[PDB]
Design a protein around this ligand. Structure first.
Ligand SMILES: [Mg+2]
Ligand SMILES: [Mg+2]
Ligand SMILES: [Mg+2]
Ligand SMILES: [Mg+2]
Ligand SMILES: [Mg+2]
Ligand SMILES: [Mg+2]
Ligand SMILES: [Mg+2]
Ligand SMILES: [Mg+2]
Ligand SMILES: [Mg+2]
Ligand SMILES: [Mg+2]
Ligand SMILES: [Mg+2]
Ligand SMILES: [Mg+2]
Ligand SMILES: [Mg+2]
Ligand SMILES: [Mg+2]
Ligand SMILES: [Mg+2]
Ligand SMILES: [Mg+2]
Ligand SMILES: [Mg+2]
Ligand SMILES: [Mg+2]
Ligand SMILES: [Mg+2]
Ligand SMILES: [Mg+2]
Ligand SMILES: [Mg+2]
Ligand SMILES: [Mg+2]
Ligand SMILES: [Mg+2]
Ligand SMILES: [Mg+2]
Ligand SMILES: [Mg+2]
Ligand SMILES: [Mg+2]
Ligand SMILES: [Mg+2]
Ligand SMILES: [Mg+2]
Ligand SMILES: [Mg+2]
Ligand SMILES: [Mg+2]
Ligand SMILES: [Mg+2]
Ligand SMILES: [Mg+2]
Ligand SMILES: [Mg+2]
Ligand SMILES: [Mg+2]
Ligand SMILES: [Mg+2]
Ligand SMILES: [Mg+2]
Ligand SMILES: [Mg+2]
Ligand SMILES: [Mg+2]
Ligand SMILES: [Mg+2]
Ligand SMILES: [Mg+2]
Ligand SMILES: [Mg+2]
Ligand SMILES: [Mg+2]
Ligand SMILES: [Mg+2]
Ligand SMILES: [Mg+2]
Ligand SMILES: [Mg+2]
Ligand SMILES: [Mg+2]
Ligand SMILES: [Mg+2]
Ligand SMILES: [Mg+2]
Ligand SMILES: [Mg+2]
Lengths: 46, 271
RNA sequence: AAUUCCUUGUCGGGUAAGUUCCGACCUGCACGAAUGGCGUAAUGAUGGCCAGGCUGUCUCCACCCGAGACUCAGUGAAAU
RNA sequence: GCUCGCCGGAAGACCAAGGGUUCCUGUCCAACGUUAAUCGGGGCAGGGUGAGUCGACCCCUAAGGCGAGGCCGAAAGGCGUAGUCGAUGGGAAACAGGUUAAUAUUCCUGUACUUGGUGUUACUGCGAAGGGGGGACGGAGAAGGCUAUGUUGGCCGGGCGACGGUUGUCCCGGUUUAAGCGUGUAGGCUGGUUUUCCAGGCAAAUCCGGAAAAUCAAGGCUGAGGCGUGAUGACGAGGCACUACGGUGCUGAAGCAACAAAUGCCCUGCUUCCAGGAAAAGCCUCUAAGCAUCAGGUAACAUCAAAUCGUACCCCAAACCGACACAGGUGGUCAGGUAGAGAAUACCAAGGCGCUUGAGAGAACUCGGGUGAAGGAACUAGGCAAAAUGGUGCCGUAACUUCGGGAGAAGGCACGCUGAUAUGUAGGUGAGGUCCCUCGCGGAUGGAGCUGAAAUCAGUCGAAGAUACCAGCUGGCUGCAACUGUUUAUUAAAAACACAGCACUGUGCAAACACGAAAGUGGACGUAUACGGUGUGACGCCUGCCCGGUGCCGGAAGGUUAAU
RNA sequence: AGGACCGAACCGACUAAUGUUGAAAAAUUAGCGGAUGACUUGUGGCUGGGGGUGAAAGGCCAAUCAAACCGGGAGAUAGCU
RNA sequence: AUGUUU
RNA sequence: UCGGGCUCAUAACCCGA
RNA sequence: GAGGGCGCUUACCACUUUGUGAUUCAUGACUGGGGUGAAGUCGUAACAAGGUAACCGUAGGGGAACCUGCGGUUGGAUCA
């Protein structure tokens, strides 16, 4: 049946992309935490 | 004119239209238009604010002169249009100085008639005039509320305000509601009953008519469950509650009215 | 009665025979007027009942055409 | 390599979304492939994505988002003005052929187009974040015209038949051609041009609006298609040569007509209805600040430029979402033949395919089917499931009824082929020839030819002519809800929700209400014939008594009564 | 003209059989309802957890919803096993 | 109010 | 309820217990 | 041979059948009213001015006769 994950990169970047994360106190905090975990990919890109 | 439909199909059988011949046909007067955009009854918070709103036809806005200035310049009403954004009907008017505007549309209306506003202005159905110079007893159209503002009372198909006394520098008005309320007297206001009045008699006839009119359905409180609205539950039908709004706010005669800041102007409440 | 417990109430009808259905009675355990009452052409993948047609639904199975099941060969699971 | 079968409104073919080198070529097979595997979307190497004109960037804006200052808020931050972003929408330009193992409206040949800078040369008031215009818009419906596209004949090239017949009313095949340029039709729309006057268009305007006279009847926008040209070409069966048997060169006939014909195009039209149907830029024109020998504006011609980034492949799927090479899911575009009402269906074309275990055997049973004596609902909770009905024209058709209906009620009759009327009819289309004329994408008269249902009569084959696929079972009584609709995605579709209508009730606009400690915002650019709350629930006939209790409304005279 | 009739696409999901270590964590197959409308769909946007959304089923809110998921208080408590 | 008796 | 009265007479009505 | 007969075939057409309707007679659980009967029970509507003059039509109400409104007629009494 029609599953839950229907891909779309415009959306993807708009909901969880770098700048949307960068655009709000807590968004940035999400970045902080990840950079502090030493994550290799903050956000997902090209 | 109102019409009954033949019952060639249930949902038409009960329909009663109100088709007015003397109405213009097709597109309106371009320059007096502007965007609109529905709102789904939703806020600037995106939250549904007023229920039952959404869907329904497209609707572009006609400007419609409510203040009625152009004192001295006469105008001749070229045509009566349909405006989707009011029960009232519309007059495309054209002033002698070569300027067009939209005006409501009194009972007499009629393309070809002559129109004028200002302190001078002859008292004739369809003209605007500070109420100070208006025989007590006249019936008068869209009435301002603060001299200058715009007119707000009696705007709706068939409505009208009778002037009942003008002692002081204020007039007392018998609104359509029944209330009697004093107002500034220097307050503009058009002569005559607002137009149409056949409105009242339409029937709709099927759920879709209201649907395509921006009115989404309303679900009774009893139908729901205890957790949604103060009514509802009980194995089957029931009630046994104390009729209230979905926010428990009590209903059925509570007035809610609360101004103090405008009490004065209210001389006798509707009944 | 989407309501009647006593209840397969009672009478009539339909049946060879009918705890259902239809019509009646009314003694309404415990209908009834926008908690709307009582009707109503059409409508309904709507509940109940009846008839013609049709039939392997059945009395009562039979044969037959295909896919598995059975033997060979390759791969090769599971619950416990 | 030869046969056999399957899909063909897809199981073909393109695009988007998504993937992200799966593409092509070599080479390898451990692992991956539900088996083998030499084969692969597997491993490794190497190769491959060519743009002024396709797309994106870019111009413009929508919903919505951000938002200097600003208004609010213990802080975080919420809101919003000028603005600035945001496409799913508006904005300039390329077609056909050829080519590669794999790209191509990108390379190549052929033939065009757009917009800017410069230059030269003639003619000329140009000029805005500004005015007007335009862009700019709904639903349904009704034709006419036309094309894509197909049939047939004509034409050309090839054929004269494995088994009786086949030099003919025979067989096979092909019969293709774009943008652009010219013409400016069927048809749609609108009366023009002149001068003068003005309290409008945030200022002006020679523009748009409005008022006057004047003076002409034909004028001006719009517009599919056809025709001409592009085409002296390209393409094109097949030839003739080479072949490292993959193919590579060179060459090339016919290329018309008549008829039928869309759901595409004329048409953003037309008729008409109510639910009354984006914004902004480019663009056309109008002035202003100004420049006034200048500069700019127009046109022809010449020249220069048009970056950047995407461009392989999959695409209704083995490449995307589903843990799988998963019977699931997934938006747009195309639409041949025979029969058909048709985008149903049955068989085919083109194109793609036989679904990555096979081979035998031919038990019970299970799955999915086909046929059945007599009987025919006995079965069973229940006719669940089966079987049955099943087309078109005509005749004909009850209660009840809201006068539409019920009704496709029910029930009957015809249905193939051939001949005749008629070597093919009513119809359709429509050329010569003739005439006319404001002259040609004209008209009139002419009816060749091309197309072609239906009817009656006669005749005929079979068991059977709607012959397959396809394709309503019908009738009586009664409950519930009027009805179309909606719901428990994943045991409930219903008698539940909704509904048009009815009532009660609140609200005088800075509304009642609602989101929010607020600013703001919804209600509503509405204003009591409106908007919110609640119950009822089409329509007909109707809706009685009870105000004690609870709730709500009004009321103060007194009793009591808070901070103070 | 029609929330009109029949009927593909498309939207649905009434019955049955199969399947129920499935081809499939809801399908297939034969029938079925709607199909110019309260129609259906692409892209994009808004509403955020005691809150949204709901033609109201406690239905839906990323395979779970009488209060989502993630992290934290946290080694909550557990006179129970 | 009734009288074969409100 | 009982006794008395009004009435032609029953009831109503009046009186007393 | 001609002609006929038998046989076969066509037309008409009685039975007879199928479908669906009109129509009339008998009957039917139950049930509305109507007629007749002896003293019943309740009241007393009308008749006199019947103790609210009577009626007609209409509509609403009520154990019952009847009440009530609206208009109309006199087939109404008093010197109103
Ligand atoms: Mg309502
Ligand atoms: Mg409920
Ligand atoms: Mg419940
Ligand atoms: Mg109950
Ligand atoms: Mg039986
Ligand atoms: Mg019964
Ligand atoms: Mg009830
Ligand atoms: Mg009801
Ligand atoms: Mg339905
Ligand atoms: Mg292997
Ligand atoms: Mg490959
Ligand atoms: Mg590979
Ligand atoms: Mg700031
Ligand atoms: Mg903001
Ligand atoms: Mg922009
Ligand atoms: Mg776009
Ligand atoms: Mg390719
Ligand atoms: Mg130049
Ligand atoms: Mg403009
Ligand atoms: Mg053609
Ligand atoms: Mg031979
Ligand atoms: Mg041929
Ligand atoms: Mg490609
Ligand atoms: Mg496979
Ligand atoms: Mg698949
Ligand atoms: Mg098909
Ligand atoms: Mg049998
Ligand atoms: Mg039995
Ligand atoms: Mg039985
Ligand atoms: Mg069945
Ligand atoms: Mg069947
Ligand atoms: Mg029943
Ligand atoms: Mg229903
Ligand atoms: Mg369910
Ligand atoms: Mg279900
Ligand atoms: Mg309302
Ligand atoms: Mg209800
Ligand atoms: Mg009541
Ligand atoms: Mg319909
Ligand atoms: Mg199905
Ligand atoms: Mg249908
Ligand atoms: Mg879930
Ligand atoms: Mg948690
Ligand atoms: Mg703790
Ligand atoms: Mg623990
Ligand atoms: Mg009888
Ligand atoms: Mg009497
Ligand atoms: Mg009397
Ligand atoms: Mg009277």
């Amino acid at each position: 049946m029609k599953r839950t994950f229907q891909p779309s990169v415009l959306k993807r970047n708009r909901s969880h992309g770098f700048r949307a994360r960068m655009a709000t106190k807590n968004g940035r905090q999400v970045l902080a935490r990840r950079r502090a975990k030493g994550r290799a990919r903050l956000t997902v890109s090209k | 004119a109102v019409v009954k439909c033949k019952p060639t199909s249930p949902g038409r059988r009960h329909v009663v239209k109100v088709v007015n011949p003397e109405l213009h046909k097709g597109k309106p007067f371009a320059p007096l238009l502007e965007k609109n955009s529905k709102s789904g009854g939703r806020n600037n918070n995106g939250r549904i604010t007023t229920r039952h709103i959404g869907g329904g036809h497209k609707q572009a806005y006609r400007i419609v002169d409510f203040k009625r200035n152009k004192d001295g310049i006469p105008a001749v009403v070229e045509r009566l249009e349909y405006d989707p954004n009011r029960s009232a009907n519309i007059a495309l008017v054209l002033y002698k100085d070569g300027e067009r505007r939209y005006i409501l549309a009194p009972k007499g209306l009629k393309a070809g008639d002559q129109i004028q506003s200002g302190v001078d202005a002859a008292i004739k159905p369809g003209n605007t005039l500070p109420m100070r110079n208006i025989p007590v007893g006249s019936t008068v159209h869209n009435v301002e509320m603060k001299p200058g503002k715009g007119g707000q009372l009696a705007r709706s198909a068939g409505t009208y305000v009778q002037i009942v006394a003008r002692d002081g520098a204020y007039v007392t008005l018998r609104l359509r509601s029944g209330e009697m309320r004093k107002v500034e007297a220097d307050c503009r206001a058009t002569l005559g009953e607002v137009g149409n009045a056949e409105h009242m008699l339409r029937v709709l006839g099927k759920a879709g008519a209201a649907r395509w009119r921006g009115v989404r359905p309303t679900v009774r409180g009893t139908a729901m469950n205890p957790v949604d609205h103060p009514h509802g539950g009980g194995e089957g039908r029931n009630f046994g509650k104390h009729p209230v709004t979905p926010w428990g706010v009590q209903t059925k005669g509570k007035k809610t009215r609360s101004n103090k800041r405008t009490d004065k102007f209210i001389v006798r409440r509707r009944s």
